[PDB]
Ligand binder design. Sequence first.
Ligand SMILES: O=C(O)[C@H]1O[C@@H](Oc2ccc(/C=C/c3cc(O)cc(O)c3)cc2)[C@H](O)[C@@H](O)[C@@H]1O
Ligand SMILES: O=C(O)[C@H]1O[C@@H](Oc2ccc(/C=C/c3cc(O)cc(O)c3)cc2)[C@H](O)[C@@H](O)[C@@H]1O
Lengths: 115, 116, 116, 115
Amino acid sequence: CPLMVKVLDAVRGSPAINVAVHVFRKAADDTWEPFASGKTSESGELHGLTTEEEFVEGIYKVEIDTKSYWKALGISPFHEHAEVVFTANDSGPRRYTIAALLSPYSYSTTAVVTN
Amino acid sequence: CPLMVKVLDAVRGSPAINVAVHVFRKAADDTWEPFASGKTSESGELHGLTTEEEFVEGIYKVEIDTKSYWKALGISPFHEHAEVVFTANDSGPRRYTIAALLSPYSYSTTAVVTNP
Amino acid sequence: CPLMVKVLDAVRGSPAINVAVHVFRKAADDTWEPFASGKTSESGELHGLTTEEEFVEGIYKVEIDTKSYWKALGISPFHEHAEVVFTANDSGPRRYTIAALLSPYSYSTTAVVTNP
Amino acid sequence: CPLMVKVLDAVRGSPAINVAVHVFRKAADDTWEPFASGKTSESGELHGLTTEEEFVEGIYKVEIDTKSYWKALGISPFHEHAEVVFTANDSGPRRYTIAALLSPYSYSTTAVVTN
Ligand SMILES: O=C(O)[C@H]1O[C@@H](Oc2ccc(/C=C/c3cc(O)cc(O)c3)cc2)[C@H](O)[C@@H](O)[C@@H]1O
Ligand SMILES: O=C(O)[C@H]1O[C@@H](Oc2ccc(/C=C/c3cc(O)cc(O)c3)cc2)[C@H](O)[C@@H](O)[C@@H]1O
């Protein structure tokens, strides 16, 4: 599992459950090609997006559908979505975790890249 | 000034100076049209991107060029850029400050929205 | 103004107004001595805590009373307060801005340190 | 395991390994009594701090020794330590995770409180 997404809710102090996440890979013509997607689990995690063989070097975009998440909780949010855009690089450690901490008018994101 | 961007550097404990910022607005055909651009000053602020007349309702994307920023500091960061995507002015004109706090493998961003 | 505190509310997208702040300094005997206090203004800023003469070298603790802030908004938050503990002025006088971004179960804090 | 601490490094994009963490419980006379301590593991986690029976309602302080962490990496940091102060409350969910994301002049912290 070379790419995992973890989403936390800073208002409720909980995992962010049932958040839609869409991953795209930048094509040669600079468009964003769908690559993988899913919804976070009860633990705020989304595993199984891709495989080692498919996850080649390149630029990827992880879009987290924060607007729908907040609206489902009856809360009015600022952003359309959170976006995390990065290069996958084979010289680095194997496993990428993209974490995001969500508030209605703010978000944090970090990368935890490990062997 | 209805759209302002402020950027801090969490490694140095300073404003993030000379950070390039590109703003786009979603057009009728659903593509991202260039809207305004600039770079942060010695205070880490970027003023003068747009005017109240030109900053109409729409979905805007503020791209903060964090990789170019870090690369000028000889650092090799994780993200390409920070993207901040939001609907603006859909309840009338507001003033928006997009703030960002940068680290090489992480960033935070928050919006301060005020009603003149 | 050599010590300034700025607080934002990540739920409302606004300055965090009326946030109480208490500053302490570690004394010779190793206890936390009260040093200054105040509350954030309508801009979320707190100025005038101290003076360059009184803000000598030492270890300071800036307590931001996030629970009292949230409780005045009828919200029940997680933390008691945010504590920011740092050595100041140990390479000569500097100006410090302690910034904080608040959510009910989370906060961020960063320092901007400048040399006059 | 009612109390767990997770620490991440935003400069390296990694768990923060071998960070000392000290937990205190506020005594009746308003002093901070040592309660538990340890060092984060290779995954940036510190488990086994306390037990359900010992972790009673009250105010706790988790001090994360960030200054020593940065200095061991040859980096000059701002804070003496990061401090997370909160009330444990039985009406809430059972398990408290205190997460912190560290930079030299900044840190983030959130609580993930679950069943
Ligand atoms: O990062 C790891 O190695 C593992 O960490 C496990 O637990 C947590 C628990 C809490 C966090 C918190 C992340 C976070 C991220 C931010 O952008 C800001 C912040 O204050 C905190 C991240 C991971 C996750 O449950 C695992 O799936 C993950 O693999
Ligand atoms: O840069 C300037 O010229 C002035 O900017 C003023 O306003 C802001 C407004 C917002 C921010 C935001 C800080 C912040 C801090 C975080 O921990 C995370 C995040 O996403 C943003 C910091 C300073 C400050 O209040 C002034 O002190 C400062 O001088």
